[PDB]
C-alpha cells in the first residue's frame, strides 16, 4: 500500500562511541574485573596458572579469575544487539582501571590469547586494529559518568533485589534515555561496587545467576524489547 | 526430580551439542586443543581450525548455568565428531576453567564415566534417537532457515511433547550433521550466531515460554 524508500539497501548501523551521547543504546559495565599483570615476561594473573605469586602479593586468589571477564565479553560481544550497533562495553578493573571496548572488536575465544591481549592493553594503554584505523580497546579516565550518556538510567545486578522482567523494564523506560547495567564479574562479594553511581538495583531471577548468564539474559530482553532480532 | 534419559514422559528442553571436537592424545593422554597442540596436529594432518574443544565448554557453561537447568527442565547431550555420544547429568558443576575441563574430559573418554561420592558424565551408545523422549519435536539451528521467535515457537508447540535443539559446536562446516534425525530446521536470530549465544537465546525463550523465571 506504500511506496518503498529512496534506498532500501541495508547499511551498517553507526559504531557507537563515548563521544556520542544522544543515540539510545544499552550500556553494560563488568565492574570489579580481576585483571592484573606481573613480570615473571608480563603475564595476566590467573587463579590456577599462578598460585604462589599471588600469595606473595598477598591478594586473595579466589578473586583472581579473569575468565569470568573473558566469558562475559564473549557473550556481550557475540550478542545480536552488539551486531546491531546498540551496545558498548565498559570494564572497571578491580584496581580502578576503566577500559573502553569498541563494539567492532573481536576478542579471542581462547583464554590464553585473551590474556595476551590485556597484558598488551594494560601496559600499552591501548590496542590498535590489524588494519590500523581505529583503537578497539582503549583505557579511559575515571569516573564512568562523564563517558556515559547525558540522559541514562543506571541499574545493578542484585540477587537480593526484587526480581523483575527485563523486557517489561526496558519497555517502560523512555526512548531518548539509555540503560546502563553494572555487572560484577567478581566470583563472590558484596553488591556495592557501584552503589555510588547507580540509583536503583534490580534482580533478574530468583535463582543465583552467573555473570555471563545474567548478561546474556538481560541483552536478549533488550533485543526482544527493541525488536533487534 | 533430576531428569534422566530413562524418563521420557516429562516435558524437558533437550540440547544436543553435535560435532563436538573432543579428542585425547598421548605423547599421557591430554585433550587436543587448537593452541596447546599445533605441531602435533600438523603431523596428524588435521587442520588446527577444527581442533577447538573450547566452544563446547562455553555452550555447556551457559546451558548448565542457565536458569532452566536450575529449574530441572534441561538435559544436555554431546555428540563428539569422532562419534562418541555423552550424557550430561544436570546436577553436575563442570569446571569453570578450560584446563580443568580438559582433565575432566580425558578421564570421561578413557574411564567412560565420572562418578563422585549416579555418574556425573556418562558415555552412552548411539544413536541419539533411542535415548530421547518418545514424543519429542526435533529442530536444528540453521542460519539460512527462516527466522522464528523462540518464545512463540515453543508456545505454539504441544505440552506432553519435548523439544530438541541440535547445535553445531563445530568451528566451521555444513549444517547437515543431524539432518537424519531432525524433521525441520529453524533460524533463531536474523544474524549469524555463535553456538554459545544461540543456546543462551533459546533457553531464555523457553524460560519465558514456560514461565521458569
Amino acid at each position: 500500500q506504500k511506496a518503498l524508500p529512496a534506498s532500501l539497501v541495508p547499511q551498517a548501523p553507526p559504531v557507537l562511541t563515548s563521544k556520542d551521547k544522544i543515540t539510545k543504546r544499552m550500556i553494560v559495565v563488568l565492574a570489579m574485573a580481576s585483571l592484573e599483570t606481573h613480570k615473571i615476561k608480563y603475564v595476566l594473573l590467573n587463579c590456577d596458572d599462578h598460585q604462589g605469586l599471588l600469595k606473595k602479593m598477598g591478594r586473595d586468589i579466589s578473586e583472581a579469575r579473569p575468565d569470568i571477564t573473558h566469558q562475559c565479553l564473549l557473550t556481550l560481544l557475540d550478542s545480536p544487539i552488539n551486531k546491531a550497533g546498540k551496545l558498548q562495553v565498559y570494564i572497571q578493573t578491580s584496581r580502578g582501571i576503566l577500559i573502553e571496548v569498541n563494539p567492532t572488536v573481536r576478542i579471542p575465544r581462547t583464554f590464553k590469547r585473551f590474556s595476551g591481549l590485556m597484558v598488551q592493553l594494560l601496559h600499552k594503554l591501548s590496542i590498535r586494529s590489524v588494519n590500523s584505523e581505529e583503537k578497539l580497546l582503549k583505557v579511559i579516565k575515571n569516573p564512568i559518568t562523564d563517558h556515559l550518556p547525558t540522559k541514562c538510567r543506571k541499574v545493578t545486578l542484585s540477587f537480593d533485589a526484587p526480581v523483575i522482567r527485563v523486557q517489561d523494564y526496558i519497555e517502560k523506560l523512555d526512548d531518548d534515555e539509555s540503560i546502563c547495567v553494572f555487572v560484577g564479574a567478581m566470583a563472590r562479594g558484596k553488591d556495592n561496587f557501584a552503589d555510588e553511581y547507580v540509583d536503583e538495583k534490580v534482580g533478574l531471577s530468583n535463582y543465583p545467576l552467573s555473570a555471563s548468564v545474567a548478561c546474556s539474559k538481560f541483552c536478549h530482553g533488550a533485543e526482544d524489547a527493541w525488536n533487534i532480532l | 526430580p533430576v531428569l534422566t534419559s530413562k524418563d521420557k514422559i516429562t516435558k524437558r528442553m533437550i540440547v544436543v551439542l553435535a560435532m563436538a571436537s573432543l579428542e585425547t592424545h598421548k605423547i599421557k593422554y591430554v585433550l587436543l586443543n587448537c593452541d596447546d597442540h599445533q605441531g602435533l596436529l600438523k603431523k596428524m594432518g588435521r587442520d588446527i581450525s577444527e581442533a577447538r574443544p573450547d566452544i563446547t565448554h562455553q555452550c555447556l557453561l551457559t546451558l548448565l548455568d542457565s536458569p532452566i537447568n536450575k529449574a530441572g527442565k534441561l538435559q544436555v547431550y554431546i555428540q563428539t565428531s569422532r562419534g562418541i555420544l555423552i550424557e550430561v547429568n544436570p546436577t553436575v558443576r563442570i569446571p569453570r576453567t578450560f584446563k580443568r575441563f580438559s582433565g575432566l574430559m580425558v578421564q570421561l573418554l578413557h574411564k567412560l564415566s565420572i562418578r563422585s561420592v549416579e555418574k556425573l558424565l556418562k558415555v552412552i551408545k548411539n544413536p541419539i534417537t533411542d535415548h530421547l523422549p518418545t514424543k519429542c519435536r526435533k529442530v536444528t539451528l540453521s542460519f539460512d532457515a527462516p527466522v522464528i521467535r523462540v518464545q512463540d515457537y515453543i508456545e505454539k508447540l504441544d505440552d506432553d511433547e519435548s523439544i530438541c535443539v541440535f547445535v553445531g559446536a563445530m568451528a566451521r562446516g555444513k549444517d547437515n550433521f543431524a539432518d537424519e534425525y531432525v524433521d525441520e530446521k529453524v533460524g533463531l536470530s536474523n544474524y549469524p550466531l555463535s553456538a554459545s549465544v544461540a543456546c543462551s537465546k533459546f533457553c531464555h525463550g523457553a524460560e519465558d515460554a514456560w514461565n521458569i523465571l
Binding site: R106, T110 | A171
Partner: peptide
Amino acid sequence: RFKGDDDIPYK
C-alpha cells in the same frame, strides 16, 4: 570476514 565461531588469525 569473520563470522560465528571463527577465531582471529593465529601466527
